[model samples]
Target chain A: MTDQAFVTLTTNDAYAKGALVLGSSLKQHRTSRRLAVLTTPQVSDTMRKALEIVFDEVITVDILDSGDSAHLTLMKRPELGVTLTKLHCWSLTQYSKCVFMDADTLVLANIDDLFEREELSAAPDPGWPDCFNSGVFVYQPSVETYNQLLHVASEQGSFDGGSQGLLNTFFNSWATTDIRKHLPFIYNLSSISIYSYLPAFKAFGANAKVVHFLGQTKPWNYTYDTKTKSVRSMTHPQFLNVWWDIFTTSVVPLLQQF
Target chain B: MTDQAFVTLTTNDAYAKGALVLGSSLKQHRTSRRLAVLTTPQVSDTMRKALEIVFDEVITVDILDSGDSAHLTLMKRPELGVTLTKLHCWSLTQYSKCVFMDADTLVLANIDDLFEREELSAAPDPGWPDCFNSGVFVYQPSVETYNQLLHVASEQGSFDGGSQGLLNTFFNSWATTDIRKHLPFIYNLSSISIYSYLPAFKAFGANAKVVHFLGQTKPWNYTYDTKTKSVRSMTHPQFLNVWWDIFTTSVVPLLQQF
Candidate 1:
């Protein structure tokens, strides 16, 4: 068995700001594995260099050029561009096992232990507890597995009409078949729309280790408002100052330590 | 000069709802030109019947099947699917002139005089003052003109990256070349991101002759507050009720008169 472990992120730079924080935040938590960023050619040079400083490898992969079958299957579902890019993790065979993190995810604590999980393990989505969130997950990569995923995606188009749907459809047996495969909900906590169903979130949200901003609006877009201190507080201008501090000040020093 | 007039709109249902409303609204205001709707096979029987009731002619044009050179060029830019669908307006050669209105627009007053303006006359986009809104525009469909528009779209792409962009780029000469071609803001008043620019909206909003919901969020998605007389008041129980009223009570009766 190969001892090499890697963590990867894919971004198109429209989400580069989020990707930067995601990489730096993970390094801040002091993960032992190699960190990598997969970006498109269109990303700005500033972002490419910033990612290079934090990640072990910053590679560019065109979704249109990825020869992986899963990617081809993804072409059939053009609506899931980001999701298809997320699934490019299955093609990273250089590492024996890998963790895929979404650009919008921020890790609050070290989660390197997630790499110990078997192929295709993820925390359940906050929106639909039965469906695993695609934002973060652990899996072994292989060309064979990538092809199989492609076939599944092409044959069964996703349920949610996005990555969540494709993943849910691929992992159809996840709801009942296996207990260990279900990672704790706190591992991939998504913050958007939690207020609509606050009671359930209040009950289970305490364990969230990684916060995922899954909707159209992201934390970076918001400024912190102390008065509201509510979800909209994330949208306030003041919070952005803190977010910038977290990005440039806190995370940079942490990466140097690694 | 051809006495026959033909108009066409894209979409199979809810958009068909907008199309039916547009046709009826145009007729209500007494448009001398004939109205037509372009539908795809996926349109439901109920919506087809509803559209048939309002439009003088209902033509089924599969965007994929148009086979025209301009359409083929337009297909190369799949990112411009919405723009291409809107461009199908130029394919209706049966009409000496036609006006295209987005499915979401509500014509508050007479707009048939728009035909008097000339080919490709459109009001300014509410989001950007310089760019014309694609929601309401007058055009004379010819295969040659359609080809030129498609070529321009393929070369320059759209200005705002959608229909507005494509239309604006094709009519690049509109901004400085001709003053008469520029329609008044009241002709295509849009309500996109209205909450963000309340002050400007309050100042210029009264002159609105049509309201186009350009963004993803619509009034139909929100609940109204009878007490506050604002959407904020209708967050939960009252949301769907107000939305239904906006659709059934307000729009449906207006459709009957057309």
Candidate 2:
């Protein structure tokens, strides 16, 4: 258990709040494994300290400091900075295996069972099911694999200009080569899936173990009325309410201490 | 080759035009398997005769005549008329094996290799990759399976109210059971996929072997200017032009003779 952890990334303070809620949600669900987060300097010292309370380790990642070749590659494709930042999760070799969750995602239940899955196991993207969503995934940590990922990122950049595209390209056989590598959609249920495939949600949504706040509006962007216990958002207010509940009850008090 | 056949269905004159073009396209691709189609009485006599010229066997399928159980089920859920009509493909017991292509689909290359696949082998749906698209699939003919499908349809209606849902429900394990059962997306590529995931389309669209016109506006629904070699449509006009070319050169001449 000590050798496995739940990892997330935050490029800024806005995402740091989400990371805090995500970590608290994971703790609330009583995950036995360690929780870790990767942060950029953009996150305030206060938020980083707050994250340290909920997470076992808060590691800093500098995209430009990733060595000379990576710097040269980023110089050519400056848009890949965030993608490279997310890739730093692979360098966390202290943990033999890790589950990477996006800052915008909230764990609805303990997902330690994800450890049973090997590297590159993830739920399918709602938009394109053949390509697994990068919002949540299981992967083994290895410096060699990390180096190969950087090589691929530099040689053939990502198709969609993000880690999801590059990771899917590296794990191209995930769709048809092995079914065990395919995780159920419930592990990372995107808000878009609710409206895009309402029938499917009605049939299977009760079992969602995680909720991902994908796209432009993060949960913090919504206005939550604690008195009314309601949130104002265009889609899936129920999930936003949960995110706000954890943030207000658990994450907010910890930030107040800082 | 004699025992294996490519099958399609047409409920009306408009879809019959699509079926004729589809059949002509299959012939143009030099498929080794025999061609067949299921037609309702709604199709014009001229169109049916034209189908007789292209297909080795033109079979008539009356949904209400599909035994007393199916009639009672359809009477209860009348909306399943088209779905029940499509399920009739499984009743083609004369053929040892069959590849069913929706009338709205066009074959771009010889797909006789599909005969090697077992029953329920199909490409994943663009909307939900977990669910195989009913536009193209390989299956064995069996009255037992046909009756079982009708039973499931009566007990529980399709989630999406379509044949795709019903078939996916019957073949529930296709997503995680066998990789061999999954046909590549290029075999049943949807037009919506081209626009929705343009990056993926740019990466893999070149290898498309079958094109499924899987929305409200089919290829025949568009206007094609043969003189300018252009098609008037909001989406992929290139595919529409191919459909129109086959219709004008092959199907139109056959219908004129009839």
Candidate 3:
């Protein structure tokens, strides 16, 4: 078994599509590490089989039945339910280290070099750069860290009401400590940057290694016009074509057999 | 002559009002350092005198005639005209070190401690936290640095079409070089945070040493109902009331004779 791996999570069928494409892209990029995914019971059996085709290990995570304390804590504040699932990444002690990418992220290049970084290393967010974007990050798996993360989630909750907030809270010193921990923007290039910081994107867009589809409109949400081989969207239709291309060529075929 | 000072710039009468209130706030906060303002020829004589009442040095600068080279550069890309005027702050070699605050910023507490920081130290911009906001920064006056800044400005041009972009380009290492160079958000607490990142503002807003009125609608842009003793505006009325209160108490008296 590979001691280092790439990990992702899927709570539903919609996100399972993203996970399949994300896994396919990592394979295409030829990452030397193993691939793993965490999924909730809500994800369909067909999608789980599709994920298994792309991923080496597909672990099932149930937030409701995790532990007595965590179950009771999640019952009070249900919004933090997904946060607990994301925190599960810390429990993958099977691998010495792992790089977690959001299902919405597409790997453009081999990022096995990400294994060199310490835990909590991530690209700065475009909206608030001081805060590391949780879309892609380098971390080591440990049961102790996972339990502490659960404690933090229950006590304080999340500031942004998402997994990103909980992760940022757990890894609080990411911004000001250790500059090497601060991954370059090209690593986890946000889709919003296609227009938010256009000049920068024009200068550095070509070097993007991982493209993260941040915000409401995921690549799957867009209407892909297979006739013209183009995507129809108001903003940032630049990367959508590539995503749909990967989905059609790689992900759709896996789902067909499922 | 004081070796350290607080600096600001005013190009027109409207900004002069902001500068006056800014200077008044600095005085009210009991800053031990000298207060200096860079004004253009367009500032009215009355406003200049009003500035003189609050600031020790009201240096008059003319962008069109400062130097033939800079004048020609401004003539070509006229939009960068204000950028040249702002670059004049580096020429005030009278002060060994200085902290430049945007006229729209109000000092809630004495930020005299800013002088202890190295050159190019500033608070993170709320818009993009990785890039330091040019609204408030600690810098040293040097003709050599000033000339280099102009060269960089003319060669590459600002990314965001403002001094902040130009400064960020010149001080490129600010984000990753030294964490100490990154000032706390409380130093240049942006007014936009009141609504944009409400939870963060609620947590850290009280420790704010300087309140920067970023974006188009400055404190001066709002209509202050003197009778009601409240500002009439849509967002961030919390700080506007304090700004107007300072304006009414200190600045209005200085401008009454004008």
Candidate 4:
């Protein structure tokens, strides 16, 4: 019943491009809620200005890290660092509710229905379907929940050494209780698995809401002409075309003003 | 508007136990629709008779072996035969609609709402959330779609060489389209990822809908005392206990009838 906002996090320079495209895509879809980006010092001054152009509010958050990756196999590979500062979304008590999405995702369609879900609503994780993917989640803005999350993170230490594990641990009840709280998977369609995308995109490409670039590549790698509307990817060149399509149509003109 | 039913598959003795629990759980929930079991010729006659007692229709299905795994996987360790006969779910024209669930699934609630869904509706894949898990899906019985699935199986084979690849390739539209067509994770909750979030599972295990025994161990290993619900797994014993309780109360009772 309270005001809700859509949130994204960019803890470093590498993710700023993701955040920009994300904000632009959200605006492109004409989301009826306020959008905010939570960033840390690692995002840098120049990139922050670039982000400010697209985002409604660019808020700086304190750095928080859990140095417990040694126990996590997921973090063991290239050591996936999860920023604890994402917890700041819960502290933004200004909004009664919020949906935190990953910076690496590109919004393809309007999903106002997401706002209708209560706290802890999320689609299942592709990797471990029992667990909710941290990429996008519906949460409430409350200082109590924020402090509780911080307490859990400090005590239990995140299971996978990332915010995904920490947040899942805090909002643990999401796996059950009510069915309406679960979001559809297309809301965060993963372009991660090469074998998977081959068959999936061919069938359901038109209905994608948010295309999450789960693998290592980013749209920033391609040279956006901002005119011809083309992208040449170093790997899996076809996906670049998706990133390019949204970028040229929605994100390009927004940034040309600079 | 033909009547709908729920269907499951069991290819061998090891999985017959899974089918027993799955079928018993479905019956225990007092499903409104009729229930059926699809079995391969590999299932022994004795087991088939036992399954017949629990299922409304224990129809025999010809083994539709993919003979498809050699080219699909990296050499092959046990050559996990996932049964291409899963394609037969589409051929059940006797029922206007059907929801196909893997034998490994133990129903925790009345999933009759799944019937309301149209063809190709399913929960997202835990392995890769973008694609729906082949474990539980809603489909119409169409000989045309059934043959088309067979044609795809013959030509492309399956990507993973199991029914999952063949089915996903067939229903490929599930990833996108109306979100209503997508089911939630509680409907197909997985029991793997033991190391990920033991505490979270402990907190929310009660809300699970279908417990998927995804690992190597099945309920067949245990000696059913029908009293102690303790499972050997170091993590989350209640889930095992739940499976045990159902197996004892429903499956074991029916199996003992013969």
Among these predicted structures, which one has the highest lDDT? 2
Q: Candidate 4 chain B, which ten residues in sequence have the lowest lDDT sum? A: B69-78
Show model 1 residue runs off by greater than 4 Å: A1-6, A66-75, A193-204, A224-244, A248-258, B1-258
Residue-wise C-alpha lDDT for candidate 3, range B3-51, written one tens digit per residue:
8999999999999989998999899988899999999889999999999
Question: Which candidate would rank higher by lDDT, 1 or 3?
Answer: 3
Candidate 2, residues A25-119, lDDT tens digits: the string is 99899999999999988889999999989899999877677553457678878899988888889889999999999999999988989999999
* Candidate 1, B1-258: lDDT as tens digits: 234453656565667666665666666666677777778677887778777777778877565666644457557777776676667778778887777777666666776677777876776543223345677787788888887887788886764567766776667665333445656656665554234334334444566566666657655555555555446541122323433445564456645654
- lDDT of each residue in B60-116, candidate 2, tens digit only: 877677554467779877899888888888888899999999999998988888888
Greater-DockQ candidate between 1 and 3: 3
User: What residue runs in model 4 are displaced by over 4 Å at the alpha carbon?
Assistant: A1-124, A127-258, B64-82, B193-205, B222-227, B253-257
**Cα lDDT, all candidates:** 0.63, 0.86, 0.84, 0.71
DockQ of each: 0.01, 0.54, 0.42, 0.18
A-chain TM-score per prediction?
Answer: 0.81, 0.96, 0.96, 0.82
- What is the docking quality class of candidate 2? medium
Q: Which ten residues in a row have the lowest lDDT in candidate 1 chain A?
A: A230-239
lDDT of 4 at A58: 89
TM-score of 1: 0.45
Candidate 3: residue A55 Cα off by (Å): 1.5
Evaluate residue B107 in candidate 4 and report its C-alpha lDDT on the 0 to 100 scale. 91
